[PDB]
Amino acid sequence: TGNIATEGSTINFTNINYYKDSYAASASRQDFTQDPTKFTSPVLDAIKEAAAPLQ
Amino acid sequence: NAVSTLADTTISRVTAANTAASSHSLGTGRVPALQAAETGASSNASDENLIETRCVMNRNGVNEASVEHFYSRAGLVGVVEVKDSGTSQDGYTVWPIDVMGFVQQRRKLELSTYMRFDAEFTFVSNLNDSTTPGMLLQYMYVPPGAPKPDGRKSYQWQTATNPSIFAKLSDPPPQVSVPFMSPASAYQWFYDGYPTFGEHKQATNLQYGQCPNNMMGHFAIRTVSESTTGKNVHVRVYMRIKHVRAWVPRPFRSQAYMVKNYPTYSQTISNTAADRASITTTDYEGGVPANPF
Amino acid sequence: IWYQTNFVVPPDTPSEANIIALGAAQENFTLKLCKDTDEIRQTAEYQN
Amino acid sequence: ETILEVNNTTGTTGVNRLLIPVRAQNNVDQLCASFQVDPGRNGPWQSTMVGQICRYYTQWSGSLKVTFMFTGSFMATGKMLIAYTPPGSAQPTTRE
Amino acid sequence: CGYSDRVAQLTVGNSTITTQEAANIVLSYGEWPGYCPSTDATAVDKPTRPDVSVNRFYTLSTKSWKTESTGWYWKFPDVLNDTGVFGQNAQFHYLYRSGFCMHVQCNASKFHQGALLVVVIPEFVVAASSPATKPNGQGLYPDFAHTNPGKEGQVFRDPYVLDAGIPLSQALVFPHQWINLRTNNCATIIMPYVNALPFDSALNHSNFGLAVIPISPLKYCNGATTEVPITLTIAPLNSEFSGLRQAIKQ
Amino acid sequence: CGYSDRVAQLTVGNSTITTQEAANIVLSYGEWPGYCPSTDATAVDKPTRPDVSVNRFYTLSTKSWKTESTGWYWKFPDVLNDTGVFGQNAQFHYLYRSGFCMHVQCNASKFHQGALLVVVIPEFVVAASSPATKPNGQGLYPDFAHTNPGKEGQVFRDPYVLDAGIPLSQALVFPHQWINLRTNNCATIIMPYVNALPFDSALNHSNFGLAVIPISPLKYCNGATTEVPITLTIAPLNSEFSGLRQAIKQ
Amino acid sequence: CGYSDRVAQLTVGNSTITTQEAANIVLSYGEWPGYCPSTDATAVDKPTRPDVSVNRFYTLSTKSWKTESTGWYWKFPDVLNDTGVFGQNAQFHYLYRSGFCMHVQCNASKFHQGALLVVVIPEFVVAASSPATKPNGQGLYPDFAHTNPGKEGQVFRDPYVLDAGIPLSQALVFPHQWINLRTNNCATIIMPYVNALPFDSALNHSNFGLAVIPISPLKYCNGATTEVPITLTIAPLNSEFSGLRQAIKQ
Ligand SMILES: CCCCCCCCCCCCCCCCCC(=O)O
Numbered sequence A: 001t002g003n004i005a006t007e008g009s010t011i012n013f014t015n016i017n018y019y020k021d022s023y024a025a026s027a028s029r030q031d032f033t034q035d036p037t038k039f040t041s042p043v044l045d046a047i048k049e050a051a052a053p054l055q
Numbered sequence B: 001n002a003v004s005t006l007a008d009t010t011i012s013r014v015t016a017a018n019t020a021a022s023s024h025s026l027g028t029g030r031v032p033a034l035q036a037a038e039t040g041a042s043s044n045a046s047d048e049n050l051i052e053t054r055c056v057m058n059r060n061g062v063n064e065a066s067v068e069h070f071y072s073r074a075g076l077v078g079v080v081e082v083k084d085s086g087t088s089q090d091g092y093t094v095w096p097i098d099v100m101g102f103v104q105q106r107r108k109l110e111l112s113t114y115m116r117f118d119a120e121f122t123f124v125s126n127l128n129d130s131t132t133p134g135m136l137l138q139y140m141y142v143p144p145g146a147p148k149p150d151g152r153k154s155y156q157w158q159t160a161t162n163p164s165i166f167a168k169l170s171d172p173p174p175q176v177s178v179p180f181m182s183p184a185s186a187y188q189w190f191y192d193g194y195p196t197f198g199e200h201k202q203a204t205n206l207q208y209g210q211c212p213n214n215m216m217g218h219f220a221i222r223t224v225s226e227s228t229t230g231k232n233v234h235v236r237v238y239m240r241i242k243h244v245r246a247w248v249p250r251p252f253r254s255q256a257y258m259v260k261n262y263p264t265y266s267q268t269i270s271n272t273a274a275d276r277a278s279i280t281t282t283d284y285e286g287g288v289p290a291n292p293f
Numbered sequence C: 001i002w003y004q005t006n007f008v009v010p011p012d013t014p015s016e017a018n019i020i021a022l023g024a025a026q027e028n029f030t031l032k033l034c035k036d037t038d039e040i041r042q043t044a045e046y047q048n
Numbered sequence D: 001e002t003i004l005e006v007n008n009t010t011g012t013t014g015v016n017r018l019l020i021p022v023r024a025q026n027n028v029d030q031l032c033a034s035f036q037v038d039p040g041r042n043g044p045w046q047s048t049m050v051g052q053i054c055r056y057y058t059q060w061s062g063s064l065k066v067t068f069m070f071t072g073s074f075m076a077t078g079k080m081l082i083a084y085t086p087p088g089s090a091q092p093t094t095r096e
Numbered sequence E, F, G: 001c002g003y004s005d006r007v008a009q010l011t012v013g014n015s016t017i018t019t020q021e022a023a024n025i026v027l028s029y030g031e032w033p034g035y036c037p038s039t040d041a042t043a044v045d046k047p048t049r050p051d052v053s054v055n056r057f058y059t060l061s062t063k064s065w066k067t068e069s070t071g072w073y074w075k076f077p078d079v080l081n082d083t084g085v086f087g088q089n090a091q092f093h094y095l096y097r098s099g100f101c102m103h104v105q106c107n108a109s110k111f112h113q114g115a116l117l118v119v120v121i122p123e124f125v126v127a128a129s130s131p132a133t134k135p136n137g138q139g140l141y142p143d144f145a146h147t148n149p150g151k152e153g154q155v156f157r158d159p160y161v162l163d164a165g166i167p168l169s170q171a172l173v174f175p176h177q178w179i180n181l182r183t184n185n186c187a188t189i190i191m192p193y194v195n196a197l198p199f200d201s202a203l204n205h206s207n208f209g210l211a212v213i214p215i216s217p218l219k220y221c222n223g224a225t226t227e228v229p230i231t232l233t234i235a236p237l238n239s240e241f242s243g244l245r246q247a248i249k250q
């Protein structure tokens, strides 16, 4: 499950820091987070899909 | 051990949200289509409730729309000209470190209000004829309040504590990692206020919007020489943000920028959307209708 | 956008109004292949 | 959800470009407005956050979402057919 | 329930706001205002929390909405920096932090129409438009009146670019709410303290801009009441002041 | 619940009809449309079920309601026999069967008034009125235009006798619903396939007549919008075509 | 058995093809036509499957084979894009997918001789031969008639290079079958949906080219029937249309 576009995994000698400072390390892009609600649904009363929103 | 750790380092595929099969819904009471934009929330309605959908097990990858991926790409942030010919025979230049100089990088970074990142800086240096001779150059980072050099050979280039980089134009471009350097907990492209107390009654309100939490000193660049080389050197500085966290998204700038550190726009307002003849005009020929029904 | 029926108002009510369209993307929306945008332009490589 | 600039016409200026005008019609089945729904294309989608983020990428996929908020008086009533035509065809000339 | 109730009551301190057409309340970034935690706190001075004295609804500015009105904006806490005990605490102390509860009240009859977008823009850096003629026009830097309008607020000159060179269409990215005279008559935005620093000077720095822009213009038939006011009411929440000294006004 | 909700959403195929004044939905004879069972099926050809292609809301006819308008009628499936993929399936095949979801949309302001009876009459045999003068007037047999109006529908000449010699007062025996501009603005009649035969020719035989008759005339005061349209939207349900051959139009 | 039977019957929908000289049936790439699986499906619209209506043998084109005939080709689904319910479904919908069952019928007496290679070429890009004289001859791009012949098919001008600059000798790499008037009189090629995309426009894009080329010329002695026809019969299989809109013809 990579971006290789074919069957194969190989061996992964990557993401190695060679310096005593950790900010010298390669871009930290192992983790992806998708929490859209803080921007798309910030209202107090959560509205169900089915129900007409204002009553 | 740490071997298992290396195995799980390739970026894994996170897929997009799947569609579920849906049928007709002929009942009163259930109204997914009806929303209330007034509440301030985006529509919660899904494809499956508005039309009859099939089951799709979506395998499209979302890993690339990340603030890491979006910003982890080196872009031009400065061009320092080390003039050593004609009227300008200084053979050194002190360039204020700011990333708001060039549109392509500025506009990307101003998507956020606050950002905390480490950056990687690359110095592509060459002559007017794009030639890279064996010419030695000193790149010295001068943190805010470190003395700035006033001459080609001044004491400030001893660098007992200032970090400097010696490289020949001949060598592949110098690169260094820089940490998150800021008194504040994050950087801040928009500061709505003044850095000093006062009444701010100046015919030119320069001080407005200028937070020194962002101003991160200068880079002093010289040709390590005794006398005028008679050659100007161009230093393209490339910044690749990394380890990036961003807060409070903002609208992408529409108007062309005018100055470096101030959002200011020409009184000619360029419309966000390219205009067309009428509100019922679309530019698509399509095909020949079978029943003209 | 077509009129399914007409826009009907009583007397002493404005007979012209507005609709505000708000565009977004759904949960299955995905992008690919980061590239530089067309949407902003400075004059040359050496500008503010 | 961010506002589409559907009224992106020669004459219209400023905030007026963000309003689709509607009115009592003497004739049934006249076309109120029309816009293409490809975020990349120069047009009403340029004014949306989705349209501006798309132009930072080459390829896009998935369902889009248009929300229409009416801002007539409480006393105003009406019905609107909002149709989406898949790629083959031109802009429909009649409601049928 | 799964639906927002139309009728709503907002009680902070010794003030209560009742509204019968609330289109729900926006909680910005899905976070409630709270006192600075020990871990985020940098400054060792014990911070005063005046509670009810400062945490209450202040009705500061009422504006007359017209058919050609272009919009108004305020800067928080600048708008309140001289009004009530809050004002005094803000002048007497250096460091400042609070979230707020915005509430814009605009009623009209069922025979008026129009839409106001009410949006809270964090770090609203007011721009100055320079005339095409001269590259560095004197109006390249906005004067103090435009950056800090105070209680009376300031009229937008170019609301399309939100006087900041960013499209109003995309302003819906910030915590926003509409006042459709068709549906509702009030907009409530609870906003937590948003800043890179845990405490900031109330006087020098404005955490948020409060912008009310008429998107759909106000229209009505001859005979209806022409005067339709828009009122801003703001309640600071979890206010915390520190670094006591001589009172300084701006 | 024990009460019909005012607000209702009807989604068939790639079409959705939203209404905020639905006075409930009539299910004719308390039976849902369904595919012909094996036991009732007489014809051995495997029947094509195009599903979403044919089963979706078609908005065919809009009519202007006036103070003296007498009413309109359509014949199903005649009304749809030339529109969309349904039309093509109906021309290409001999045998036909489906129920339908009628939805008549008529909005007006709270200052208009009037009542439309919307009624589905199975086997609506249009009569022809013969003038008293001659016993066998040429207009004893209604011409093809009156029996099969198609998409545009036909104006009633004598809506009191529903152009069939049967009193309109007793038309409420058939599946019906009212559009009182006071209460509602839409009428939905789901109708199952009603015929003595399990499958019939879409072209030759009309299973149902769709009649919209203004009982209480449309009245309003000077200043209101005179143009008040009535729109017919029909969605075939559980459509099944069989006996494929050369496409025949009527 | 371990041998292909000479006599064979092919029944799809309401059509049956019987042949007493079938030289076996080719299943292209050893894969049967099937409906798009959930995993490969990209488009969220529910896809209509008309089954028997569209999935049946259509006899479209008959051609007269002569001693100097050079060959004919058709483009699928272009050949069927205007014939029967398939044609209508293909015009009314955007996305399209189906495999097909080809069957080329050519009988002659035991005293005629000749060989036809019948080959299905996926993505048959018709080339245009430019005369040696001019480097960019106007006939560098083949006109619409050559790329999309429709029902009537198109005569090869250079069958040796299959009008595409690729040798006919190596055309046997594609799914093919011979009609040796010595042995057989029919060629059947079942072909699954072959495309980089799960669904494509029937009108714009042609998945396969159907080429019948006489390798060994037709020869016979004076007295035999000179008129020897070659008939193309095609049955779409597991047809699936999606994205319903206004009918578009090419
Ligand atoms: C010798 C070279 C060493 C590299 C040192 C690089 C130091 C860079 C500081 C960090 C850069 C990010 C902050 C940019 C903020 C400036 C924006 C502005 O206020 O105009």
Ligand SMILES: CCCCCCCCCCCCCC(=O)O
Pocket: A009, A010, A011, A012, A013, B003, B004, B006, B007, B008
């Ligand atoms: C130099 C030695 C590096 C070893 C790195 C780990 C390799 C593990 C073998 C399997 C390949 C990784 C992906 C997987 O687990 O399938």
